[PDB]
Amino acid sequence: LIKENMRMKVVMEGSVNGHQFKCTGEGEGNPYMGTQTMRIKVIEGGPLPFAFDILATSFLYGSRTFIKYPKGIPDFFKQSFPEGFTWERVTRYEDGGVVTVMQDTSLEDGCLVYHVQVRGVDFPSNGPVMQKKTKGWEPFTEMMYPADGGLRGYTHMALKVDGGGHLSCSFVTTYRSKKTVGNIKMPGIHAVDHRLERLEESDNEMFVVLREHSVAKFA
C-alpha cells in the first residue's frame, strides 16, 4: 500500500493566541528513503500574526509514514495501513507557550490524507513567536518508545530566534494505530533523526515549502 512514491494532502485548522487560521498542503516523497516535500498555503487567517515555524512541525514532524527504517527495526507507521494511525501531541515552549495537536493519517485512493487540529495559547505578546522573529528548527532526534501497542515519541527541539538565540521546546507525542483487522509487529526503543527545512517562502509566509528527511536508528 505504501509505494516508493506516495503523495500526501493536508488540512490544518486551529488558533494561536486566539488568532484563527486554516492551511492546506500537498506534496510527495519516498517513504522508504525518509524524504518528503510539501507545498503549503495559508488559506484563512493570513497573514498569520505569529511564526509559521510553530505550525511547521505539525505538517511534517507530522508525516511519520516517510521514515527510512532498517529491516531490523519494525516500522509501526507503514504497518498501520490501510487504516492508518493518529498522533496527539503537547508541546511546551521556553518562556511560555503551549500547543496541543490532534492528527489523523488516512490512505484514500492511494494518497495519504492528513487532518490536523492545532491550538496554541500563552505565547508572550512580545516574544519571538508572536513577533515573527524565528529562524527555523534545528535538526532533532525523536526517541521512540513502545507503549501499550502504540508508540510514545519524545523530542527536545530548539527553535532558532533572531540574534543567535534559541527557545527550547519539548514534544511528547502518542502515536496510535487505527488498524481493526491484521497485525502490527511492535519495535523496541529506537531513535529517529529528523531534518525539517523551510524553503521557498513568500514575504509574509502565505506560501511555504517544507522539506523533511527522517531516518530511524538504534537508540
Side-chain angles (χ1 to χ4, degrees), residues 51-70 72-90:
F52 184 84
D53 284 323
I54 295 310
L55 305 185
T57 54
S58 295
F59 289 97
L60 240 15
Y61 168 180
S63 185
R64 290 290 172 263
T65 307
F66 307 76
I67 302 168
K68 180 175 196 313
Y69 271 87
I73 302 169
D75 187 340
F76 175 85
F77 304 102
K78 296 185 188 51
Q79 282 185 92
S80 72
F81 292 96
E83 301 91 332
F85 61 89
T86 65
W87 59 260
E88 296 271 299
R89 178 184 282 165
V90 172

Side-chain angles (χ1 to χ4, degrees), residues 3 49 62 144-145 169 205 211 217:
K3 303 179 152 43
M144 300 290 205
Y145 301 86
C169 308
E205 294 185 317
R211 178 154 68 184
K217 69 177 179 184

Side-chain angles (χ1 to χ4, degrees), residues 16 48-56 128-134 159 198 205:
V16 178
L48 301 178
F50 61 85
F52 184 84
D53 284 323
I54 295 310
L55 305 185
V129 172
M130 300 312 298
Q131 295 298 311
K132 296 189 77 160
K133 302 186 179 149
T134 70
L159 183 56
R198 150 169 68 83
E205 294 185 317

